[PDB]
Amino acid sequence: TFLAYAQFNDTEVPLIEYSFYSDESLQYPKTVRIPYPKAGAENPTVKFFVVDTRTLSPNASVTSYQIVPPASVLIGDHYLCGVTWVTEERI
Amino acid sequence: TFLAYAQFNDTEVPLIEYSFYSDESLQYPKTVRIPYPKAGAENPTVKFFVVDTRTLSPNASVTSYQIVPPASVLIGDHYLCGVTWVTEERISLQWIRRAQNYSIIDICDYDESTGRWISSVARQHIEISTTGWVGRFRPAEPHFTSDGNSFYKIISNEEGYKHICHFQTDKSNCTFITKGAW
Numbered sequence: 001t002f003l004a005y006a007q008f009n010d011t012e013v014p015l016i017e018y019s020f021y022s023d024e025s026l027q028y029p030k031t032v033r034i035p036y037p038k039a040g041a042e043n044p045t046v047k048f049f050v051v052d053t054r055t056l057s058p059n060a061s062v063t064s065y066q067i068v069p070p071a072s073v074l075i076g077d078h079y080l081c082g083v084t085w086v087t088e089e090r091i
Numbered sequence: 092t093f094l095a096y097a098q099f100n101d102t103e104v105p106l107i108e109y110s111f112y113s114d115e116s117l118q119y120p121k122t123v124r125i126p127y128p129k130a131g132a133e134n135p136t137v138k139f140f141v142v143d144t145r146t147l148s149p150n151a152s153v154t155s156y157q158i159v160p161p162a163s164v165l166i167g168d169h170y171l172c173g174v175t176w177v178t179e180e181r182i183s184l185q186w187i188r189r190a191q192n193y194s195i196i197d198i199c200d201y202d203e204s205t206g207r208w209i210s211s212v213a214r215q216h217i218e219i220s221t222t223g224w225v226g227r228f229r230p231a232e233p234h235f236t237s238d239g240n241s242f243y244k245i246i247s248n249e250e251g252y253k254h255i256c257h258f259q260t261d262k263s264n265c266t267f268i269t270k271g272a273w
């Protein structure tokens with residue numbers, strides 16, 4: 001019925017950059033960049049969502065609710081490290 | 092339960108402009124600008140949505156469905172000209188071609204299992220004019236019975252007089268309940 005999903009925001013995460021040379025024919029090396037948070041750096045932020053797929057239709061908005069973590073955690077930087085469906089109406 | 096609203100987009104509508112001098116102390120006239128379409132100009136477009144205000148909540152998205160005009164009207168420039176709530180699960184939308192000698196009443200039913208407002212050719216009623224325009228200024232509003240299975244509305248009769256016809260919500264023929272040269 002539902003389709004839970006997390007959204008990840010790397011906007012303020014620094015980029016690690018390194019070279020990838022590739023096949024000999026590649027005249028200039030390619031610069032690979034990954035939003036990679038190193039110790040103490042800005043980490044990416046996260047949002048969780050449960051979507052009710054039943055109202056999914058081209059001319060219809062998306063029905064979704066954002067489940068925020070308990071305040072003791074919402075207080076500061078946090079990580080979502082687990083998602084377990086128990087029943088169709090309990091996550 | 093539901094909140095319906097129409098969205099108007101004037102992006103491509105030319106702007107009329109004129110001076111507004113305001114109070115004497117104003118040293119420079121301000122220029123009023125209004126998106127206002129003149130004959131033949133580009134018209135604003137419209138969209139109709141039905142919000143299901145039951146889901147509304149701070150950390151929740153707006154659950155809404157868009158009802159679009161029936162094909163015969165979609166084909167070109169149109170105007171939404173009437174919105175009438177029949178029942179918590181039945182809403183009547185009245186559209187009309189930019190021409191205005193052709194309007195249609197589309198009666199949509201809510202689908203509990205999908206949250207969308209469905210339409211059907213059974214519940215669509217056409218009104219037209221071959222000698223002019225529909226309605227006196229705008230097509231007359233339908234008046235539904237408490238169960239929304241039929242409705243009463245004014246249209247021109249065979250003699251060209253505006254009288255009350257009776258429509259079965261899901262049948263195209265209507266019956267006049269009034270008649271005369273008035």
Ligand SMILES: *[C@@H]1O[C@H](CO)[C@@H](O[C@@H]2O[C@H](CO)[C@@H](O)[C@H](O)[C@H]2NC(C)=O)[C@H](O)[C@H]1NC(C)=O
Pocket residue numbers: 009011012
């Ligand atoms: C990803 O996170 C960034 C912040 O790191 C969000 O950017 C902010 O967006 C709001 C509203 O759009 C602005 O008022 C802020 O000024 C922005 N902050 C900065 C410093 O960029 C961004 O909206 C997030 N993206 C999504 C889709 O969640």
Ligand SMILES: *[C@@H]1O[C@H](CO)[C@@H](O)[C@H](O)[C@H]1NC(C)=O
Pocket residue numbers: 058059159210
């Ligand atoms: C919305 O659904 C209607 C069905 O009545 C369809 O005719 C219309 O093209 C759809 N609009 C889109 C493409 O979102």
Ligand SMILES: *[C@@H]1O[C@H](CO)[C@@H](O)[C@H](O)[C@H]1NC(C)=O
Pocket residue numbers: 100101102103
């Ligand atoms: C308004 O109409 C323009 C096209 O004229 C379109 O590009 C734009 O996305 C529309 N705006 C909205 C929010 O529907």
Ligand SMILES: *[C@@H]1O[C@H](CO)[C@@H](O)[C@H](O)[C@H]1NC(C)=O
Pocket residue numbers: 068148149150
């Ligand atoms: C909604 O989310 C904000 C933070 O994203 C939080 O402050 C608030 O407690 C949440 N309220 C609800 C509807 O649970």
Ligand SMILES: *[C@@H]1O[C@H](CO)[C@@H](O)[C@H](O)[C@H]1NC(C)=O
Pocket residue numbers: 190192219220221222
């Ligand atoms: C509505 O007007 C258009 C152009 O003015 C015309 O082609 C069409 O036949 C008219 N409809 C009727 C019923 O006369």
